[PDB]
Design a protein around this ligand. Structure first.
Ligand SMILES: CSCC[C@H](N)CC(=O)O
Ligand SMILES: [Zn+2]
Length: 544
């Protein structure tokens, strides 16, 4: 049995969960649920990313403490993820004593080992508020086209890009005061010292080809020292021995993966597992599921931080693409920027889990939620292929055979075809070729429905003396449903629970080798109903 620690990226505390987050958390959860079904020790770890200047300022604007605000969003996030049945073993916060201690420990080791440099930089500063301004908190007039009210390093009228120091008549977004350049000592992590180590990691063949290609572009451009400090006022962790200095959010954020695991171990009273998973000699596996917009932090800064502080590095990074809706980036004006909470007012979680899983692969390409296709595919595949095998057969079993399945399989060869597919389907789940697994499963579902059509139970049922034939056919279909629901158990947790209640059995991966014979099943109300485009139209309207 493997020991596996899996994470998803830590959601920003000052935004609601949306369908882009859900792609990542669903992808990870399907993989995690499969690994648990194969008997491994799995720890699925996440947390909110709760630090930084935007959070500090938003809390001030709301007139509440940052602690109050992040606490409220953590609850909102966890409610949403729970509604999608994301099966975390722990959901913590980067704003935690565990992450503080681990961030201070890693920093102190990096510093003792020679990987922290001090250098003075010059940055725009709001003298009224009394704070350095990140680029997006500076506004002014575009130096090229003279358009007013442009933010940060780019103009949304003419498209020009420039340093915010080039803005005409610059203003602080916080106070309206004119910012000035001010010097400040910053601490830098010496990423370039890890170049050779990181290049060897890139060539090993573990990472997604597309990610390794991006890494080569970054090595070509040249690694640079990384500014990991921010001046007060800040919401984050203060740097030991450096009054008025804080760790930049992105330094402490991946350490939050460790902090969340430490929290889980401590709450369990488990004094051994943290070191078993994070020491350099670990035999446990560590996987980060992440989006393509945060590769650099996880593939360059993070392994180097771990190496330099005497911890193990990730076994793999699993990177996915962006979510599009109807082929395009999510659009507020079109109602396609869809929150996870809004989704659940209109559809169940299983429908989206299924749709994403059917499109996902081991590559980093974007995943398109085409809403018309969503309706067609859920109805065709879930209602009419898989659930149909239960719904078309269970009525006869319950009404004419007292709920009892036949004592033998009607078509043992066909059953073996279904169980023989377990190796390829499981390999597809394992390798993250989710679309391939779904295609195989639905090909089997087509065979199962062809079997039932060939036996014509709606004819057999009306013909005198054919009761045994009817029970045989319907029991065979139910056993095929049992197998397909096992293969789909990582994908469709709630439907699976309903299937298990109907079948009077928990679905295990190995259990498919023992069909249900001479076995009582239960009645059920609709296992899964059809959806329609009116519901899609309502979702879109509700999201505008
Ligand atoms: C350690 S992963 C942290 C991920 C960031 N919170 C994503 C973002 O804010 O864009
Ligand atoms: Zn301009």
């Amino acid at each position: 049995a493997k020991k596996i620690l899996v994470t998803c990226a830590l959601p920003y505390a000052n935004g609601s969960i949306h369908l882009g987050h859900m792609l990542e958390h669903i992808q990870a959860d399907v993989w995690v649920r499969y690994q648990r079904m194969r008997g491994h020790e799995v720890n699925f770890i996440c947390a909110d990313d709760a630090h930084g200047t935007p959070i500090m300022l938003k809390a001030q604007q709301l007139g509440i403490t940052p602690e109050q605000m992040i606490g409220e969003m953590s609850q909102e996030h966890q409610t949403d993820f729970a509604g999608f049945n994301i099966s975390y073993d722990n959901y913590h916060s980067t704003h935690s004593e565990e992450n503080r201690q681990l961030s201070e420990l890693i920093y102190s080791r990096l510093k003792e080992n020679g990987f922290i440099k001090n250098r003075t930089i010059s940055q725009l500063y709001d003298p009224e508020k009394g704070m350095f301004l990140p680029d997006r908190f500076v506004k002014g007039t575009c130096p090229k086209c003279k358009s007013p009210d442009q933010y940060g390093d780019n103009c949304e009228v003419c498209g020009a890009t420039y340093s915010p120091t080039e803005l005409i008549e610059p203003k602080s977004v916080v106070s309206g005061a004119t910012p000035v350049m001010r010097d400040s000592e910053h601490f830098f992590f010496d990423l370039p010292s890890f170049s050779e180590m990181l290049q060897a990691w890139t060539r090993s063949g573990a990472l997604q080809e597309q990610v390794a290609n991006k890494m080569q572009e970054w090595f070509e451009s040249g690694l640079q020292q990384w500014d990991i400090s921010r001046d007060a006022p800040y919401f984050g962790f203060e740097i030991p021995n450096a009054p008025g200095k804080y760790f930049y959010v992105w330094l402490d954020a991946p350490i939050g993966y460790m902090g969340s695991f430490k929290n889980l171990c401590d709450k369990r009273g488990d004094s051994v597992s943290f070191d078993e998973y994070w020491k350099k000699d670990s035999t446990a596996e560590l996987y980060h599921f992440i989006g393509k917009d945060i590769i650099y932090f996880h593939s360059l800064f993070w392994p180097a931080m771990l190496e330099g502080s005497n911890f193990r590095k990730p076994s793999n990074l699993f990177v996915h693409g962006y979510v599009t809706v109807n082929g395009a980036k999510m659009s507020k004006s079109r109602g396609t920027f869809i929150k996870a909470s809004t989704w659940l007012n209109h559809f169940d979680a299983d429908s989206l889990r299924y749709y994403y899983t059917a499109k996902l692969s081991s590559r980093i390409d974007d995943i398109d939620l085409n809403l018309e296709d969503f309706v067609q595919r859920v109805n065709a595949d879930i209602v009419n292929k898989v659930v149909n095998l239960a719904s078309r057969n269970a009525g006869f079993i319950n009404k004419r055979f007292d709920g009892v399945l036949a004592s033998e399989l009607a078509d043992p060869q066909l059953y073996k075809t279904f169980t023989d597919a377990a190796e390829v389907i499981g390999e597809a789940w394992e390798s993250r070729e989710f679309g391939k697994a779904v295609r195989e499963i639905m090909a089997l579902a087509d065979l199962a429905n062809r079997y039932v059509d060939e036996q014509a139970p709606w004819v057999v049922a009306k013909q005198e003396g054919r009761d045994a034939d009817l029970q045989a056919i319907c029991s065979m279909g139910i056993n095929l449903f049992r197998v397909l629901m096992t293969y789909l158990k990582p994908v469709l947790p709630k439907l699976t629970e309903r299937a298990e209640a109907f079948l009077n059995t928990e679905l295990t991966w190995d259990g498919i080798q023992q069909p249900l014979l001479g076995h009582k099943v239960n009645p059920f109300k609709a296992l899964y109903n059809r959806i329609d485009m009116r519901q899609v139209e309502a979702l879109v309207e509700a999201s505008k």
